[PDB]
Amino acid sequence: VQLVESGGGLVQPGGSRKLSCSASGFAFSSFGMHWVRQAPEKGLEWVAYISSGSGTIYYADTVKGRFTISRDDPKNTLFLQMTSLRSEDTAMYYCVRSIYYYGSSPFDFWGQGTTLTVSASADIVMTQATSSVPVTPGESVSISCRSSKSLLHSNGNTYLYWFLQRPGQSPQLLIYRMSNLASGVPDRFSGSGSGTAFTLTISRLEAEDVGVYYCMQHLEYPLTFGAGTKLEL
Amino acid sequence: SLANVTYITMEIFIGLCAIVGNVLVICVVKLNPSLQTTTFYFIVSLALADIAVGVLVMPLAIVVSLGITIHFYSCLFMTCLLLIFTHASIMSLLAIAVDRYLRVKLTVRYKRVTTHRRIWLALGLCWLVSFLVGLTPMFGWNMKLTSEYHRNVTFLSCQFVSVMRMDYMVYFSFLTWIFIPLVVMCAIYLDIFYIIRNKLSLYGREFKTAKSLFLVLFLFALSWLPLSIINCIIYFNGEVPQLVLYMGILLSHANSMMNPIVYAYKIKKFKETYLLILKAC
Amino acid sequence: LSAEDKAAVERSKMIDRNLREDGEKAAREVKLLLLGAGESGKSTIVKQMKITGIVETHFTFKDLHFKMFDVGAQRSERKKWIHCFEGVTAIIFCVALSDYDLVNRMHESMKLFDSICNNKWFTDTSIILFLNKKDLFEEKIKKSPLTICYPEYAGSNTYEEAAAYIQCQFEDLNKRKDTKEIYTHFTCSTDTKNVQFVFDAVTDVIIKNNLKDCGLF
Amino acid sequence: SIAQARKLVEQLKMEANIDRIKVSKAAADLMAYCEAHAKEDPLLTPVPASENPFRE
Amino acid sequence: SELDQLRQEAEQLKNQIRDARKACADATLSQITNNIDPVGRIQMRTRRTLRGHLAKIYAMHWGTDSRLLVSASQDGKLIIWDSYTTNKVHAIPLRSSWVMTCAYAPSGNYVACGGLDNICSIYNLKTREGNVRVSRELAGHTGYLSCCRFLDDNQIVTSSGDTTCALWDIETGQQTTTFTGHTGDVMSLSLAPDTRLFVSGACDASAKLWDVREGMCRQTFTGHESDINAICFFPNGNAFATGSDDATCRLFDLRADQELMTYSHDNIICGITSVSFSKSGRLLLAGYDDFNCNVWDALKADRAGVLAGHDNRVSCLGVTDDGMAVATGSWDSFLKIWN
Ligand SMILES: CNC(=O)[C@H]1O[C@@H](n2cnc3c(NCc4cccc(I)c4)ncnc32)[C@H](O)[C@@H]1O
């Protein structure tokens, strides 16, 4: 599993540029792709998503119609064409693979991402109760966040995802669907919730837990990331 | 006056028998999935056409023969629906014939050249051309263009010939969509018989298939040729008895009830399902 | 309505489309089952057409992809797994005539052929009979009479006469003459006439099935 | 000789000396196990559509 | 010495065993079950239909969560069906389409596939790359494989066409234990809930119990007169039903060591291909060679239910661990859910 993105750097306002992503180590045509942007001062933000069968192409409300996403399975490439971009589009972009089935772990692997710098409602809001909480090795931390509506669907599944972005590395998935942990993640984390109020505890905190914790809901396609909680060692 | 009542009763009987038979055929096709293949794709269309002839034609034909005073562009479409359904049945029979021809000519790549999508497209094109041919009298080939004194018939009585032209039932209907398909099916059956004789005569099987083809062709002839030539005789300024005109329509509508007996009965697999549902259900 | 289950339904639809494509590709090809007593007579047939349990041999001839399945290396009860071969197109039954002088094997081959041609699962599958080792049989004709294993045989010691008698004896064991077709053909180490006859018999089976499917014939 | 005959005799001797329980006690245990799990089996007792996940 | 001594020794041992079984048998099962109220008629309705398969479906197996199931057909495609949404979760292309059995691990990570080929290949469903691949290739047997089951995440029991059974270790791919006590083609296996014993039914009209660790034959049952096709263990771990082609299904017990009760009927002359108990074991579902399936009472031996939803010979009949519903699959490429 490896994702290599390219096509960043300095860009003129109103121009056009095509980010190119190469995937290896897994089936490219089987996994859908998501593009997540991170501002130098703000948190993550979903941009676009393309399915495995190149269908149901949806875009966010702020990037609807301006950007375009395409994929080539025989060539194993992902093209993100951004034309006439605004000055507020300068951010670091990441390509994320996902798959949708019973027992799947979507958003498991995150790409390296490329930084692009521009030269000079009707969405679920994730209200985070805190922005920065100091922690100590061996102690415990409780992260909480609220949503605009109850994420408890009729099927009983809570579409909640917790990601951890380490300083200088790509984010990684810790707990998906609020009841299952991703592969390679220690079972010391514990996420729970009743649909509106969520609680994430980290038992036996270590030095590798330093980073920013982002919460994400997947009840609707316009994914909205939280403000992020930065833990100080 | 009793002859008309007897004709109406026999028409009711034929329509009811055709409806029952085609409903049974459709139920057998939909219930047992062991025969949902490229073969019955045309049989379903034939059964639907026969159901249409039994439901939206036979009572309509009786009402037209009664002579009820109705609108001009009322019965005209009512009578054109009969032509639509008859041409749909003829196109379904022609599709069955061309499928039997392709199964003996394109044997090596049959399932490679005609998939389900192409069969559905062919059936759709057949239904479309049937509806187009059947709606041609409403496009200008009606009694208004025949002579004067017409088109002032808002409230007139309707009798099949009162609003329809006889030349259409001869040149456009018979000589284009009745006689030509008959010759095509005859040539197809002759080619199939020749291929079977060349590939098998290296006797009972030959006799059985020859009897089947001859019976199909003879029933089609006995159904369609009588009133078709009756119309030609009328077009030649001749004379036709009144009872023969009804007997021709009776023999023509008997095709809708005799098709499942001559097509679905000789499948050797539909008969098994029929006897199974007769013994069990 | 659902959030993530719509992508699952899309994936299921794509998997169903792929399964239908694979099914159409398999139906485009033709499958045959190899049977008969003796390994040499079947090994030579497998060798004459080629590009542990069951052996699967694929080869393309005249744009038709023939897949021969050999179950000679099973050594188990046949009536417990033969029903899996109900959908085969043809049964290539190969036997060696030289067994008519080797110890008794001709009776076993005839019994196997009678059991195969009378199976309830093979009611719609044709059998193509192959008689291997024709030169060895012709040489053995001039050495030992045919009446060594056929007491009812009474005639001249001729190769063609003995071959016709063996063919008639093999054809008389079939009780479904009105349904099955026996394509007897002498085969040996020769040119592609064997695969040509196999192709002809496959086309015959296909046209017979297509005529019995669309109606009577 | 003994590869297929002596082993059968040894197996029969091992099976003959095994402990056996009366059929009455076995039937009593079986009926008790069936009665104790009567309400636990959704196929035996009628299950409502709200509790059954396979409802339409 | 000579075979004449061993023959009479085996004969007298069988005579002593029969005399002991006759002396220990004091009453029948009907006389003690007459005091039990019958279940009566139990109507079952088809909830879900699965028409994804294009060929004859052979076998299926339920998982621990009783939601996902594995299905194998003649076309050679392992399909993972979701019982609630009827969506195809995973599609595994097989190297050999001649398969007749499949297995689902209790953990839900690996699956087994086997049939006419002598290899019950293992496929991992939780691969990180997202695609399915061969996990283990068991190429030690020589006959057609009839059944394969998982005892744990590292051990797998397998029955071949020959009169032997094998216990393969997934870590190394070697036969841990080989069972040669059978005298016929082993047709079906059935594991006990305690995962310590397992009973196998073969073509020699006998069912043999074996230990997963010791490997010695404990008891042998010879109540049938024809080849046994399918077998299932009782949820309590003390009994098991065996179905044969003689239209009779016999319920044997481990403690009783004798056929408790037989299920058959005059109009039912076709054999049995699949048999399985419910969660409580009160209802016994049996698929026959005809177009219908039966559901008998394990105590009263009465036809509690008849399912005529299929139009071909029933091939597989799986029951969930919690008894919520059952899955019936036949050669008509249709897998239906009944409850
Ligand atoms: C290809 N399509 C047809 O053949 C249809 O045409 C109908 N169809 C023909 N001819 C009719 C008739 N005859 C009136 C008539 C004819 C000649 C002279 C006189 I005066 C009066 N009456 C009632 N339906 C008549 C038939 O009912 C078939 O379904």
Q: Does B34 touch chain E (CB under 8 A)?
A: yes
CATH number of C105's domain: 3.40.50.300
Q: Is B61 in the pocket of ligand 1 (CB under 6 A)?
A: yes
Q: Which two tokens stand for residue C118?
A: 């009378």
E contacts of B33 (beta carbons < 8 Å):
311, 332, 334
CA of B9 from ligand 1 middle (Å) equals 18
Chains B, A in contact: 3+ Cβ pairs under 8 A?
Answer: no
Give the type of residue at D9: V
C contacts of B266 (beta carbons < 8 Å):
215-216
Return the CATH architecture of domain A2-118: Sandwich (2.60)
Chains A, C in contact: 3+ Cβ pairs under 8 A?
Answer: yes
Nearest-CA residue for atom 22 of ligand 1: B160
Q: Does A27 touch chain E (CB under 8 A)?
A: yes
Q: Do C216 and B268 touch (CB under 8 A)?
A: yes
Q: Which two tokens stand for residue E299?
A: 């105590």
Q: Is B217 in the pocket of ligand 1 (CB under 6 A)?
A: no
Nearest-CA residue for atom 21 of ligand 1: B161
Find the Cα–Cα–Cα–Cα dihedral E54, E59, E62, E63, rounded to 10°: -90
- In chain E, the number of structural domains is 1
Q: Does D32 touch chain E (CB under 8 A)?
A: no
Beta-carbon-side half-sphere exposure of residue E288 (alpha carbons within 13 Å) = 23
CA of D56 from ligand 1 middle (Å) equals 52
d(CA E252, CA E142): 31
Q: Are E188 and E147 spatial neighbours (Cβ–Cβ below 8 Å)?
A: yes
Q: Is residue C25 part of a domain?
A: no
CATH number of E285's domain: 2.130.10.10
Q: Is residue C9 part of a domain?
A: no
Burial (CB < 10 A; 0-12, 13-18, 19+), residue A210, is middle
Which among E167, E170, E150 is positioned nearest to E64, based on CA atoms?
E150
Q: Is residue C209 part of a domain?
A: no
Domains of chain B are 2-279 (1.20.1070.10)
Q: Do B99 and C214 touch (CB under 8 A)?
A: yes
**Domain coordinates of chain D in residue numbers?**
2-54
Q: Do C215 and B107 touch (CB under 8 A)?
A: no
Looking at residue B164, the DSSP 8-state letter turns out to be B
Q: Which two tokens stand for residue E88?
A: 């195809």
Q: Is B251 in the pocket of ligand 1 (CB under 6 A)?
A: no
d(CA E116, CA E96): 9
Chains D, E in contact: 3+ Cβ pairs under 8 A?
Answer: yes
Q: Is B160 in the pocket of ligand 1 (CB under 6 A)?
A: yes
C contacts of B205 (beta carbons < 8 Å):
217
Chain position carrying tokens 């019958």: E38
d(CA C190, CA C187): 8
**Domain coordinates of chain A in residue numbers?**
2-118, 126-231
The nearest CA of chain B is from the CA of C27 a distance in Å of: 8
Nearest-CA residue for atom 12 of ligand 1: B160
Q: Does B281 touch chain E (CB under 8 A)?
A: no
E contacts of A183 (beta carbons < 8 Å):
128
Q: For domain A126-231, is the CATH number 2.60.40.10?
A: yes
DSSP β-ladder status, A32-38 and A16-24: unpaired
Find the Cα–Cα–Cα–Cα dihedral E177, E181, E185, E186, rounded to 10°: -50
The nearest CA of chain E is from the CA of C121 a distance in Å of: 13
Q: Which two tokens stand for residue A67?
A: 């950007």
For B102-106, the CB contacts below 8 A with 24+ separation are B103/C207, B103/C210, B103/C211, B103/C213, B103/C214, B104/B191, B104/B192, B104/B195, B104/B196, B104/C207, B104/C210, B104/C211, B105/B191, B105/B195
State the DSSP string of chain A: -EEEEE--EEE-TT-EEEEEEEEESS-TTTSEEEEEEE-SSS-EEEEEEE-TTS-S-EE-SSSTTTEEEEEETTTTEEEEEEES--GGG-EEEEEEEE--STT--TT--B---EEEEE----S--EEES-SEEE--TT---EEEEEESS--B-TTS-B-EEEEEE-TTS--EEEEETTTEEPTT--TTEEEEESSSEEEEEESS--GGG-SEEEEEE-SSSS--B---EEEE-
Residue E257: closest C-alpha in chain D: D20
Q: Is B164 in the pocket of ligand 1 (CB under 6 A)?
A: no
Burial (CB < 10 A; 0-12, 13-18, 19+), residue B6, is exposed
Q: Which spans in chain E are helix H?
A: 3-24, 29-33
d(CA E221, CA C136): 52
Q: Which domain holds residue C67?
A: 32-203
d(CA E53, CA E255): 42
d(CA B63, CA B75): 10
A88 beta partners:
none
Give the type of residue at C167: Q
E contacts of B32 (beta carbons < 8 Å):
311
Provide the b/e sequence for C74-93 (b: ≥16 CB within 10 Å).
bebbeebbbebbbebbbbbb
The nearest CA of chain C is from the CA of E339 a distance in Å of: 24
Q: Do E88 and C11 touch (CB under 8 A)?
A: yes
Q: Are E81 and E68 spatial neighbours (Cβ–Cβ below 8 Å)?
A: yes
The nearest CA of chain A is from the CA of C15 a distance in Å of: 11
Q: Is B130 in the pocket of ligand 1 (CB under 6 A)?
A: no
CB pairs under 8 A between C and E: 86
Q: Which domain holds residue E182?
A: 3-338
Which among E281, E301, E295 is positioned nearest to E234, based on CA atoms?
E281
* Residues in Cβ contact with E40 at an 8 Å cutoff, skipping those fewer than 6 apart: E304
Q: Is B81 in the pocket of ligand 1 (CB under 6 A)?
A: no
The nearest CA of chain C is from the CA of A140 a distance in Å of: 32
Cα distances (angstroms) measured from residue E192 to each of E237, E254, E320: 5, 11, 15
Looking at residue E145, the DSSP 8-state letter turns out to be P
For E33-41, the CB contacts below 8 A with 24+ separation are E33/D27, E33/D31, E33/E299, E33/E300, E36/D31, E36/E299, E36/E300, E38/E297, E38/E299, E38/E300, E38/E302, E39/D44, E39/E282, E39/E283, E39/E297, E39/E300, E39/E302, E39/E304, E40/E304, E41/E304, E41/E305
Q: Are A29 and A73 spatial neighbours (Cβ–Cβ below 8 Å)?
A: yes
d(CA B177, CA B179): 6
Question: What is the structure's resolution, reported in angstroms to one decimal?
Answer: 3.3
- Of B232, B252, B253, the residue with max ligand 1 atoms within 8 A of its CB, to mutate for a pocket test, comes to B252
Q: Are E329 and E315 spatial neighbours (Cβ–Cβ below 8 Å)?
A: yes
Chain position carrying tokens 């091992």: D14
Nearest-CA residue for atom 26 of ligand 1: B249
CA of B237 from ligand 1 middle (Å) equals 16
Q: What are phi and psi of C172, to 5 degrees?
A: -70, -20
E contacts of C52 (beta carbons < 8 Å):
118
Mutate to test the interface with C, among E48, E54, E147 (most CBs of C within 10 A): E54
Give the type of residue at B261: I
Q: Which two tokens stand for residue B32?
A: 């047992």
The nearest CA of chain E is from the CA of C29 a distance in Å of: 13
Burial (CB < 10 A; 0-12, 13-18, 19+), residue B142, is buried
Subunits with 3+ Cβ pairs within 8 Å of E are A, B, C, D
Q: Is residue C20 part of a domain?
A: no
- Of B89, B158, B170, B227, the residue with max ligand 1 atoms within 8 A of its CB, to mutate for a pocket test, comes to B227
Determine the longest span between alpha carbons in chain A, in angstroms: 50
Q: Are A165 and A231 spatial neighbours (Cβ–Cβ below 8 Å)?
A: no
CA of B6 from ligand 1 middle (Å) equals 18
d(CA C131, CA C116): 17
Find the Cα–Cα–Cα–Cα dihedral E130, E136, E139, E143, rounded to 10°: -70
DSSP β-ladder status, A9-11 and E57-62: unpaired
Q: What was the experiment behind these coordinates?
A: cryo-EM
Nearest-CA residue for atom 2 of ligand 1: B83
Which among E257, E227, E222 is positioned nearest to E239, based on CA atoms?
E257
Provide the b/e sequence for A123-156 (b: ≥16 CB within 10 Å).
ebebebeeeeeeeeeeeebebebebeeebbbeee
Q: Which of C15, C19, C81 sits opposite E116 (nearest CB)?
A: C81
d(CA B88, CA B125): 10
Q: Is residue C109 part of a domain?
A: yes
> Which residues on chain E place their C-beta less than 8 Å from a C-beta of chain A?
67-68, 82, 85, 87, 89-90, 108, 128-131
CA of B143 from ligand 1 middle (Å) equals 15
DSSP β-ladder status, A189-193 and A132-134: unpaired
Q: Which atom of ligand 1 is nearest to the CA of B174?
A: 1
Q: Is C177 left (phi over 0), alpha (psi -120 to 50) or beta?
A: alpha
Looking at residue E163, the DSSP 8-state letter turns out to be S
The nearest CA of chain C is from the CA of A99 a distance in Å of: 8
Residue B34: closest C-alpha in chain E: E332
Subunits with 3+ Cβ pairs within 8 Å of C are A, B, E
Q: Does E311 touch chain B (CB under 8 A)?
A: yes
The nearest CA of chain A is from the CA of C205 a distance in Å of: 40
d(CA E169, CA A164): 38
**Homologous superfamily of domain range D2-54:** Transducin (heterotrimeric G protein), gamma chain (4.10.260.10)
